[PDB]
Design a binder for this molecule. Structure first.
Ligand SMILES: C#CCN(Cc1ccc2[nH]c(N)nc(=O)c2c1)c1ccc(C(=O)N[C@@H](CCC(=O)O)C(=O)O)cc1
Ligand SMILES: C#CCN(Cc1ccc2[nH]c(N)nc(=O)c2c1)c1ccc(C(=O)N[C@@H](CCC(=O)O)C(=O)O)cc1
Ligand SMILES: *c1cc(=O)[nH]c(=O)n1[C@H]1C[C@H](O)[C@@H](COP(=O)(O)O)O1
Ligand SMILES: *c1cc(=O)[nH]c(=O)n1[C@H]1C[C@H](O)[C@@H](COP(=O)(O)O)O1
Lengths: 264, 264
């Protein structure tokens, strides 16, 4: 995508060399924003082939309130393998926080149900937020939340969403993240009888790993193609009733995929 | 300031009319980001006279972990009066969350001290964050956190900070929020022996209240003056030991003040 390739180039041009947690080294910038008019098409990267099944299953897994990779494995999704324990658990990550944020007194808050009811009963609200950044359970998570905070917004019958990503691996994670959130907005809009608006992505530490330089240069030489179109084939009784089988992508004609190692 | 005045014009140029919680009505845009290089000068609005006295006291109050307006009152600051109860309490708002975020297992996390330790021992960390968005305690708060989540970053010996403000009253609140955080960055940098970098402001629902329109156009007809300079006269033993008297703002020649009603 135009704005994705531009960020990719910006990181190369203005990035500072940093020794990161993995000891791999990164080139990074701090503070960046992008906006995607979802009406213009589904923001799935065309300069390299991305696989929807992993994106879709991870999102459905999140909405289930699940934190164990078992489900992901039943569907051949291996993206979280390197951080799960002997028992396949990742800790109280995204899924647990979305559906059952634990209160200090033992209760649990379901942020997704709250958000649904807000979009339906009070769309003008400036508090339609979901946060995965639970400070009191951070030490129990396999990896701290990358996409950690998002807010919904409704104007002119259109639903927009802004994500704050504290840490962003531009080559591997960013394409997944954008598509995952674009997808959720479509599901939310469908469940709330709203049209899709914009997806605004805001990043904190935005980086390119040193061992992704070749892959980046390769990708930067490819011309972006027209964005695909998402089609939801069924309308479930609720936001928790979607299945992988309900999503179809039309007109996705990307450039060949590019392989790259993950920083553990 | 140039960045601030451009934002106002943007809200006016592409904002949508929205109804709101206060019943006032607003002109609103969703998603915006601006950057202030702190080395260029202290970002205190010059197109209208701002009162640094209240900005400073509110910040020291936050750092103390206080949520009762008594302290503010003994210092003649009345900015939080309309939301305080009979006892002057605001509930577990900013001060409490920054200094004592309650965990489900009975602990309390001091996010300010943790951040300070991170800046000293692991400045390259991508997790130097402070969150006021405690989902489990939102129901006890007089008003949900407007400036809800901020992240620090270090590069080239300079300290940067990005704030995600979920709701923003452009005319009244924003000048306060910008100066407040720029002040926090200076204090943090002085404690960690770092230079001041950039302050990146990101907003969710950014709006102008319907009853601030005349004031807004009056302000926009003014030319910004040179930014003032911030001088810290002492280096306290801890970030919690600053006093109002340690700060001095020089070269501040603002245009006349413009009064506007606050929406409760
Ligand atoms: C974001 C996110 C979720 N995640 C989780 C997640 C967890 C830790 C991380 N760590 C680092 N260093 N970068 C990441 O982007 C990252 C992402 C992902 C994990 C792996 C792949 C990945 O290896 N992608 C391959 C496809 C492999 C496959 O289809 O199985 C690719 O080339 O695209 C993508 C996303
Ligand atoms: C942000 C923030 C902190 N706060 C708290 C705070 C709480 C609720 C809010 N509610 C609304 N609708 N807008 C706000 O900006 C806002 C701000 C402020 C509160 C009041 C003023 C205010 O009345 N502005 C006058 C100040 C006069 C005085 O000093 O007493 C001004 O002309 O600036 C500014 C900041
Ligand atoms: C985390 C997972 C995700 O959804 N998106 C991402 O891009 N990432 C990346 C960021 C970073 O490279 C690594 C997480 O490491 P850290 O916690 O920031 O040190 O995965
Ligand atoms: C809240 C407090 C602050 O520091 N700064 C702000 O700009 N505000 C504003 C935002 C909004 O106009 C109102 C809070 O209302 P709501 O919770 O968003 O409905 O005060």
């Amino acid at each position: 995508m135009k704005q994705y390739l531009e960020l990719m180039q910006k990181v190369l041009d203005e990035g500072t060399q940093k020794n990161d947690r993995t000891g791999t080294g990164t080139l990074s910038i701090f503070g960046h924003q992008m906006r995607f008019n979802l009406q213009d098409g589904f923001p799935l990267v065309t300069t390299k082939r991305c696989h929807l099944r992993s994106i879709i299953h991870e999102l459905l897994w999140f909405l289930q309130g699940d934190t164990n990779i078992a489900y992901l494995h039943e569907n051949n999704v291996t993206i979280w393998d390197e951080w799960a324990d002997e028992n396949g658990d990742l800790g109280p990550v995204y899924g647990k926080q979305w559906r059952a944020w634990p209160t200090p007194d033992g209760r649990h808050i379901d942020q997704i149900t709250t958000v649904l009811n807000q979009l339906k009963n009070d769309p003008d609200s400036r508090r339609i937020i979901v946060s995965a950044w639970n400070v009191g359970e951070l030490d129990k998570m396999a990896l701290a939340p990358c996409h950690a905070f998002f807010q919904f917004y409704v104007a002119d019958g259109k639903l927009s969403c802004q994500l704050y990503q504290r840490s962003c691996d531009v080559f591997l994670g960013l394409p997944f993240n954008i598509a995952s959130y674009a997808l959720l907005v479509h599901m939310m809009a469908q469940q709330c009888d709203l049209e899709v608006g914009d997806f605004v992505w805001t990043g904190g530490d935005t980086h390119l790993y040193s061992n992704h330089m070749d892959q980046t240069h390769l990708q930067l030489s490819r011309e972006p193609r027209p964005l695909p179109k998402l089609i939801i084939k069924r309308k479930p009784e609720s936001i928790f009733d979607y299945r992988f089988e309900d999503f179809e992508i039309e007109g996705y004609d990307p450039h060949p995929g590019i392989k790259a190692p993950v920083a553990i």
